[PDB]
Amino acid sequence: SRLMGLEALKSHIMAAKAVANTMRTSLGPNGLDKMMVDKDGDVTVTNDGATILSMMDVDHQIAKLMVELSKSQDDEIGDGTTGVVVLAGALLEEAEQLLDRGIHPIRIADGYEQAARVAIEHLDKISDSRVVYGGGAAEISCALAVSQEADKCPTLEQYAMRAFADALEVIPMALSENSGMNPIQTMTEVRARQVKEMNPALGIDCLHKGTNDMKQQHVIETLIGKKQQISLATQMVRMILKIDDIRKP
Amino acid sequence: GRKVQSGNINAAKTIADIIRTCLGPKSMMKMLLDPMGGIVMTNDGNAILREIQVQHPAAKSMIEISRTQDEEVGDGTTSVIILAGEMLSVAEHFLEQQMHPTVVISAYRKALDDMISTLKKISIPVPQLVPGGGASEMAVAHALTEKSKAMTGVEQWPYRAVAQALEVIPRTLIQNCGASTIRLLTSLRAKHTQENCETWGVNGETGTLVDMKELGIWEPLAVKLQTYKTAVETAVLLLRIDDIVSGHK
Amino acid sequence: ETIRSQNVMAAASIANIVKSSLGPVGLDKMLVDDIGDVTITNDGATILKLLEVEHPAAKVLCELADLQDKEVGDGTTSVVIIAAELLKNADELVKQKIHPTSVISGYRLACKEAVRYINENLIVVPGGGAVEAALSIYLENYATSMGSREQLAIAEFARSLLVIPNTLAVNAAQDSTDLVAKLRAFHNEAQVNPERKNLKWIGLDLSNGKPRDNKQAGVFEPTIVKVKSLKFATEAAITILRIDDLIKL
Amino acid sequence: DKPAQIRFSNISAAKAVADAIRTSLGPKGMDKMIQDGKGDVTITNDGATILKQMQVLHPAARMLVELSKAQDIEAGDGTTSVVIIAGSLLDSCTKLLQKGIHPTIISESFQKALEKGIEILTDMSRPVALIAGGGAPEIELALRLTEYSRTLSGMESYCVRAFADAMEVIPSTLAENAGLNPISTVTELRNRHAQGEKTAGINVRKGGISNILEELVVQPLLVSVSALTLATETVRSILKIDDVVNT
Amino acid sequence: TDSSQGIPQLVSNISACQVIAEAVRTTLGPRGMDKLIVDGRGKATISNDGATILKLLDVVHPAAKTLVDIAKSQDAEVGDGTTSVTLLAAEFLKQVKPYVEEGLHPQIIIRAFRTATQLAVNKIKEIAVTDSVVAGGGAIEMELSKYLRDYSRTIPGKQQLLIGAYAKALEIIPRQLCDNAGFDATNILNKLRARHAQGGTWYGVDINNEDIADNFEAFVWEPAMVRINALTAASEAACLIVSVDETIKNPR
Amino acid sequence: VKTLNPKAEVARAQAALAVNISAARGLQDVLRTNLGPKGTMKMLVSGAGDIKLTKDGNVLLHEMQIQHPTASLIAKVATAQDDITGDGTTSNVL
Amino acid sequence: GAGDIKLTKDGNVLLHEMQIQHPTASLIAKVATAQDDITGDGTTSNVL
Amino acid sequence: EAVYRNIQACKELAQTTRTAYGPNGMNKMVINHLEKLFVTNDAATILRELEVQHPAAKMIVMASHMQEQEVGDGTNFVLVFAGALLELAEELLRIGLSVSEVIEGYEIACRKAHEILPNLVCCSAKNLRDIDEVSSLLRTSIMSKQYGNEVFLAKLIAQACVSIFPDSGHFNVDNIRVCKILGSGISSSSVLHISTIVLRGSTDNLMDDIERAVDDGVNTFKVLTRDKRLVPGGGATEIELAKQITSYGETCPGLEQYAIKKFAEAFEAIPRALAENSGVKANEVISKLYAVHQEGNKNVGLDIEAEVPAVKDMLEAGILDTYLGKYWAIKLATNAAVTVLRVDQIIMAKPA
Ligand SMILES: Nc1ncnc2c1ncn2[C@@H]1O[C@H](COP(=O)(O)OP(=O)(O)O)[C@@H](O)[C@H]1O
Ligand SMILES: Nc1ncnc2c1ncn2[C@@H]1O[C@H](COP(=O)(O)OP(=O)(O)O)[C@@H](O)[C@H]1O
Ligand SMILES: Nc1ncnc2c1ncn2[C@@H]1O[C@H](COP(=O)(O)OP(=O)(O)O)[C@@H](O)[C@H]1O
Ligand SMILES: Nc1ncnc2c1ncn2[C@@H]1O[C@H](COP(=O)(O)OP(=O)(O)O)[C@@H](O)[C@H]1O
Ligand SMILES: Nc1ncnc2c1ncn2[C@@H]1O[C@H](COP(=O)(O)OP(=O)(O)O)[C@@H](O)[C@H]1O
Ligand SMILES: Nc1ncnc2c1ncn2[C@@H]1O[C@H](COP(=O)(O)OP(=O)(O)O)[C@@H](O)[C@H]1O
Ligand SMILES: Nc1ncnc2c1ncn2[C@@H]1O[C@H](COP(=O)(O)OP(=O)(O)O)[C@@H](O)[C@H]1O
Ligand SMILES: [Mg+2]
Ligand SMILES: [Mg+2]
Ligand SMILES: [Mg+2]
Ligand SMILES: [Mg+2]
Ligand SMILES: [Mg+2]
Ligand SMILES: [Mg+2]
Ligand SMILES: [Mg+2]
Ligand SMILES: [Mg+2]
């Protein structure tokens, strides 16, 4: 019972924000590697999961829960398992500031559920093959969608709908990082372009090819390979955002 | 009560115990140690009281009351600090049984009205005189103990306690002669339960029981009335003081 | 801890200082002066104009008590008690996320709907503990038939008005819960049963331990004293509630 | 080094001169005992005097206290909402600085928002001109600037959004002091403003939100426009300040 | 803690029961915070049910242990209502601590949780409707409270402020039902109390939306027998922990 | 809570008999050597240093640094008791 | 050591069975116990 | 200073039991040497798991065991009355009389009390086979132990005892076996056949209490076979004994007077502990009992039922006690108190 309550969700979040901050520097093609070193091994890998996640992080029984839930993404829905740990980390990092205002965790979970419904309700508008165009562009066409619908919610969920918008823009901000670009400047200079000219394909060019238009760079994401990230991450937050105690005899 | 009618009884107990033995024809000197050289031996209760800095308001009130009685009646000024330390010593045994000070004050003030009925009855003319020694106290005590057999109330134990508290005057007139206060006071009780033996007291110089109509000790019934009134009034003026708080004026 | 509980504790301290000398039969207090000149007195009207109060909340409470005393020369030691009890219960309310303003609005509503029912107890007011134990039940019924964020500050204004009947019975050695609950069980069948409407004069008796009719026994109290006391205790509680920080210069 | 600690020893000395004046805002404003050095303690609910006699001693604290004086010499009654504004703008600038953007960008984007705010607080106005006070001129600012921060590019549309989110403080304090749930009522106020209602706001007598303007206090523009202008000036001056040098 | 004999021991037992309930409180309701209890093998168990949390919890305090045994006994035979039982028990204990700090004495608090509980099960068996069902989600603890306080107002003696505290101690089930959903309890409960004063003997907390709702019409139902058994078991657990005066720990 | 301390408590019933008897015994053991012929003088050095052979009771008790207050008493009462008889101290103290 | 209490008002059983710390008193008891078996019982008066 | 450490331990032994005297006695959680929580009301089982090690207190426990094997009840009387005896002796030794002067005073007062008792008996057991006269009369023994189903257990034990009973006495308390079938339903208990009570509890921790209550029950039938004389229970006989002993002490002169009056005030400690365990104020009820016993009611005792201090006749109410069970109780309590009053300077022994 030691450290239970709304001070146990600042520790659970500091724990699930460590396994995410490490995986935050490996998203893009320019993803900086890590070194596998155990009793015997010198593997250098940047991929995900078993290659990174499930060979480390035995702490707080919650990093073990992120890595326990990310096994559902890989082997099973393509291999998009770095985007779900970074997205879960971002959602919890915004929940950290939503809790300080005094919003009950269940309320934040319902807000994330509504926002994920809106996002997945917006990704299926951009099936263009089965396929959602964009390296960093799918998470900026939804963040723009769940930001508008946010102000159409009269309850406390509106704050959670906006935090979900602010956290969906972390995928196209570790893509700006991990390269020689500025995260905020680049993420916004392409977010202000999906508005003022309707093209959700505009995204970050992690490779410096030169065109911020993922429709022609031919960098694609399978739709069910994005309907999972937005869903499996929310179903991971709503499991880490709702447990109130870790008792260890 | 609480720790305020039990911190006013320990002040009264302390003041009584300081002078308790300075009573009788067989008085016992006390040593007053000044700051520089000190010793001055005096068996006079008043000076001992007028020279010790007590600094406690309860004790300051017992000293004040005693000085007033001394400058009013003269005699019976060390039998007032006693019978007020003794009648308070017995009050604490009921403030420990969760008995409101109002109840003991309603018993003390009720015992007094019966205390001054036998002094009017055991007196002898030429105003009137009352048997000295311990005879007047043991007679009043026995009278109250016989009047307390028809009380049928909760203020029945504090009634007998006052009665048995008017025995510290014989208890000290026997202790200063070297005799045993127990084996002799029991004999006094036995003598006083008879018909005419209301003047049997204690020979203050030999430590034996003598009829005071044959030894010739008699105290005027105006220093035995003011003594009892002042004692049972300083016993209900220190029992109804619920708090000692600061005061600015 | 916050500086609202500190003001509540200061008011409670001055209350506990005054509240054992309330009724006609009430123990005294001793107010040690600077040199040590002690004055032993009940009648808190003086204990409040002689007490060394340094805390600002105790100071404001003393100021409003003296204002009431000079408005009408009675009911100045009950104002402090009712005000400190209001403050205790209001602190218990605020400590479960009830803003001090909702509690203040509740106290205003209660003090305004209590003097509009004391004009159904007036003839003078029965006195004793009748009006208090009647307003208790009336306000506990009037609160629930409102259902606003302040429906809980009228039921803590009704269970905190019975501090006068609850301290008028420990200053009478009778009881605290039993006597007040027989008082609040007679006044129930004066607002529930229309036949026994003359059970609204049944206050409590300070001689015997049993509630009697304080109209057939002449223990009345002028209506302009009870109304002024409820109207000044309410303002005192409100004044000490509307502060929430102490600015250091 | 020193810049990144004298932009956080001013933004934490001005944000502590605002959270000593905040719950004194409005009709149902909580009082605040003032402990003089002699010892006597007085009680007032107006933020003007509390700032007047405060012994601030800090550069930014004084910059914020002299803002109340400017606001009451320019408009008369804004002397504790402008301090709350210019302390929450700095609260937002505390997070905008950890992101890593430069203070000369959160100073040219506030004037990029204040100039739009001027054109939002002149549309609500009923030309006599008067604006619907009570919380409207700030929830409308938040909503409209958030809508307008989505049409802006670069680091600009990241501080204007912080401007909007920092506007939702006077409605929060007015809702708190009125005995409401601040977050829930602020969300309901925003959802009532997006649906068209521009007169909305916390009616503190009733104890809740209201649209009818009869018992909804109306204030001149000069007070709200002056509050925005002076608060943005003061936060621009505090952001572009490092290295307090002793001559 | 003193925990010697009498008031100190009772306060200690009350605090221990408060702790053991506080470890399960958030689990109450349909949607309740989970708990991550880990055994000695490194297994992570996430379960939002009070039964499976007390059977996996180290009870090393005597009073807490007795409360947990009574809760497990309720869970074994009945099933439903193994966290509401311990919640009601710990709340009954929490709301008589301010009266047991004085010399009220437990023997009298025990002749207030047995008259009041018998009366409440009578009221349940009299107000239940048809197998017999009563509206859950509060709507009973918000009615049994109104009935018990309105009845305690007509009691001359010490049981007035003990039944009136028994009644006030029932409002926790309709309170943490909405405190778990995050519904600003001090408003929904105020509405429930106001709506139970006038009428509406079946109005309880709604979980789909932050407002009161007639719980009989909304078909959120609870078997009358189950509620009676839960109330009796909670009251008996309270009386047990109130009827304990000392802890005689054998030296060996 | 001003002034709640019952001070001034020393030497109860024997604690004073023991002290006074020990003081008298010490004063005896100081003057025990000076009694009778074949006795023993004492020095009595002042502050300036004026030594003074002073074998007797009066000049000794009247001029020596007697630390114990009880012995100081016994000497103030014994010196004032040998001017009506001439000289009988050093036997009184013993 | 086991806890067998024994009301023992007399000199022999006392001096012969009690924890006498002082060595001199231990002597006086070893010499007084061995001196009351030729007379029967006269201890408690010897020690006094 | 060594006879006060003994008294100050016999007090603390009497305070952990005083609170479990009447039918409203408290109910403490006695952790077993095997760590098995059986919260029990019986205050003879408490001593088993308390294992008092202070030797002065151990003697009062030995007297309690003597009372537990000589008769079957009064185990608390023997150590809530001896505790009062010593508490008042310390209140009397400080006056300075001596250990010697209060022991013989207590012995005189105990000899007096054993001559007052046969004049306090007010009922009998005319027919020890009439089943209502064996249930309604054996009720008090269980009522004091298990308040609640006092009459059901009374009848169910009356059946067992009356069944196996010869025409001459020879009641065997070891004949009545007690099964403990772990069923459910107290009412389902019955008497099979030497007899046996199946005693179907619910959790094998609320029939162990019933098993001890059955023990105390049939133990009252055994003593009822030896002495039919019954005395009023619930403090009636105690207050009457205290009144008459106080009178005797007032007549008798000498130093024994104080010890006799203290023996009476030690008898008043039974209804004081009877009332203090019910919420009512003790002084109120001791005054209301002494004032109705002075008129000569002789049978009125504590009214456990009411909330306020109340008095009620105990003959017409049927709350009686057993003569032998109090004769032996007073005897053993006096013998225990005077014993640890003698003991001074508890020395350690020599390693054998
Ligand atoms: N050529 C590219 N240009 C821009 N973004 C890319 C490119 N290739 C992949 N991405 C983006 O990288 C992210 C996937 O990171 P990745 O390392 O593939 O994670 P995972 O380990 O889960 O496969 C997606 O957001 C995807 O859109
Ligand atoms: N010769 C005597 N024998 C016995 N008692 C005496 C004698 N002389 C005085 N007393 C008693 O001594 C008590 C106190 O007398 P004393 O010591 O002079 O002081 P006080 O002023 O208190 O009387 C009185 O009760 C008085 O009767
Ligand atoms: N004789 C009495 N019997 C019952 N109640 C009384 C009696 N006298 C006064 N009271 C009650 O005691 C309360 C307190 O009055 P008190 O404190 O003595 O003076 P004040 O009126 O200044 O408070 C009053 O409200 C009054 O109703
Ligand atoms: N009747 C009202 N209802 C709602 N808000 C009000 C009302 N009157 C003033 N306000 C708010 O109070 C703020 C003005 O600050 P104020 O506290 O009046 O400064 P001062 O401390 O100088 O009085 C503005 O936000 C204004 O909207
Ligand atoms: N759909 C619902 N709406 C409102 N209240 C509910 C609903 N379902 C259950 N409850 C309430 O939640 C309380 C707790 O039930 P739950 O925790 O699910 O199982 P248990 O009754 O075993 O604790 C019950 O008292 C019930 O009244
Ligand atoms: N020459 C002597 N032989 C024997 N005894 C003597 C002689 N001179 C004096 N004494 C005794 O010594 C005793 C004590 O005398 P001392 O103490 O020296 O002086 P003081 O006589 O002043 O006390 C006297 O009682 C006296 O009898
Ligand atoms: N119903 C009752 N009302 C009042 N006093 C009772 C009642 N039943 C029993 N008593 C008294 O309290 C005692 C309780 O018995 P208990 O103390 O448990 O047994 P023991 O005599 O072995 O200590 C009875 O012996 C009797 O003196
Ligand atoms: Mg990939
Ligand atoms: Mg005299
Ligand atoms: Mg008055
Ligand atoms: Mg203003
Ligand atoms: Mg369930
Ligand atoms: Mg000579
Ligand atoms: Mg012999
Ligand atoms: Mg028994």
Numbering used by the authors:
A (entry chain E): 26 to 154, 417 to 536
B (entry chain g): 19 to 144, 405 to 527
C (entry chain a): 15 to 137, 408 to 533
D (entry chain d): 28 to 155, 420 to 538
E (entry chain H): 13 to 142, 403 to 524
F (entry chain z): 4 to 97
G (entry chain Z): 50 to 97
H (entry chain Q): 27 to 219, 372 to 530
Question: Which sentences did the original study use to describe this structure?
Answer:
The chaperonin TCP-1 ring complex (TRiC) acts as obligate folder for >10% of cytosolic proteins, including he cytoskeletal proteins actin and tubulin. Eight paralogous subunits (CCT1–CCT8) assemble into a hexadecamer of two back-to-back rings, enclosing a folding chamber. This architecture facilitates nascent protein recognition at the apical domain with a built-in lid, as well as binding and hydrolysis of ATP in the equatorial and intermediate domains to drive lid closure for open-and-close conformational transition.
Beyond the closed states, initial 2D classification revealed TRiC in the open state (open TRiC) for 10.7% of particles. These generated an open-state consensus map at 3.5-Å resolution, ranging locally from 3.5 Å (equatorial domains) to 9.0 Å (apical domains). We built into the ordered map portion all equatorial domains up to the ATP-binding pockets, which we again modeled with Mg2+–ADP–AlFx, although the ligand density for CCT4 and CCT5 subunits is less well featured. We then used an open-state map filtered to 4.0-Å resolution to model apical domains to the less-ordered map portion by molecular dynamics flexible fitting. In open TRiC, a substantial portion of the N terminus is disordered in most subunits. Therefore, unlike closed-TRiC, the pre-strand coil is not available for inter-ring contacts and the N-terminal β-strand is missing from intra-ring sheet formation (which is now three-stranded). Additionally, the inter-ring plug-socket interactions seen in closed-TRiC have now disengaged in open TRiC with a rearranged interface. The rearranged intra-/intersubunit contacts in open TRiC indicate that the septum structure at the ring–ring interface has become more dynamic and less constricted between the two cavities when compared with closed-TRiC. Indeed, our open TRiC map revealed weak substrate density at the level of the equatorial domains, surrounded by the less rigid septum. This density is positioned >30 Å deeper into the chamber when compared with the actin and tubulin positions in closed-TRiC, occupying the same site as MLST8 substrate in the human open TRiC structure.
